[PDB]
Amino acid sequence: FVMIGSPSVRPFKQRKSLAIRQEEVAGIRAKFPNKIPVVVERYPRETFLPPLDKTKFLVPQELTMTQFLSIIRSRMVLRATEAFYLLVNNKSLVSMSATMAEIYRDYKDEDGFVYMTYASQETF
């Protein structure tokens, strides 16, 4: 039974050259500066999951991924009997107990954006 595949509007690594977004990084860090910007892209390849209304979240210095995860599962649709992993950089399975500050220390990308993918299953 062929699972299907969905829009998956294009990766935001790719929707900017670095210099289209480098501004924004700086820009929003300036107005609410004591906050961490997250980019949350669906896994490109992912098929059972629905992708988000929006991609650039601001965050609190200190937020468990668990909470964060919830506030993401929260904007998805009728969905908590059914779990999905939330990976940093699509690569990195992390503590689910970790202040966002913590993650922003480790994995802040080239631009201040910490990128996350979320998938229903992945092999590496």
UniProtKB/Swiss-Prot annotation:
Q: Phosphoprotein among the record's keywords?
A: yes
Annotated keywords: Autophagy, Cytoplasm, Cytoplasmic vesicle, Cytoskeleton, Lipoprotein, Membrane, Microtubule, Phosphoprotein, Ubl conjugation pathway
Domain of life from the UniProt record: Eukaryota
Q: Where in the cell is it found?
A: Cytoplasmic vesicle, Autophagosome membrane; Endomembrane system; Cytoplasm, Cytoskeleton
> What assembly does the database describe for this protein?
3 different light chains, LC1 (a cleavage product of MAP1B), LC2 (a cleavage product of MAP1A) and LC3 (produced by one of the MAP1LC3 genes), can associate with the MAP1A or MAP1B heavy chains. Interacts with TP53INP1 and TP53INP2. Interacts with CALCOCO2. Interacts with TECPR2. Interacts with TBC1D5. Found in a complex with UBQLN1 and UBQLN2. Interacts with UBQLN4 (via STI1 1 and 2 domains). Interacts with UBQLN1 in the presence of UBQLN4. Interacts with TRIM5. Interacts with ATG13. Interacts with MEFV and TRIM21.
What name does this protein carry? Microtubule-associated protein 1 light chain 3 gamma
This molecule's function is given as: Ubiquitin-like modifier that plays a crucial role in antibacterial autophagy (xenophagy) through the selective binding of CALCOCO2. Recruits all ATG8 family members to infecting bacteria such as S.typhimurium. May also play a role in aggrephagy, the macroautophagic degradation of ubiquitinated and aggregated proteins.
Q: Indicate yes or no for the key word Cytoplasm.
A: yes
Look up and give the organism this protein is from.
Answer: Homo sapiens (Human)
PTM field: The precursor molecule is cleaved by ATG4 (ATG4A, ATG4B, ATG4C or ATG4D) to expose the glycine at the C-terminus and form the cytosolic form, LC3-I. The processed form is then activated by APG7L/ATG7, transferred to ATG3 and conjugated to phosphatidylethanolamine (PE) phospholipid to form the membrane-bound form, LC3-II. During non-canonical autophagy, the processed form is conjugated to phosphatidylserine (PS) phospholipid. ATG4 proteins also mediate the delipidation of PE-conjugated forms.
Family to which the UniProt record says this protein belongs? Belongs to the ATG8 family.
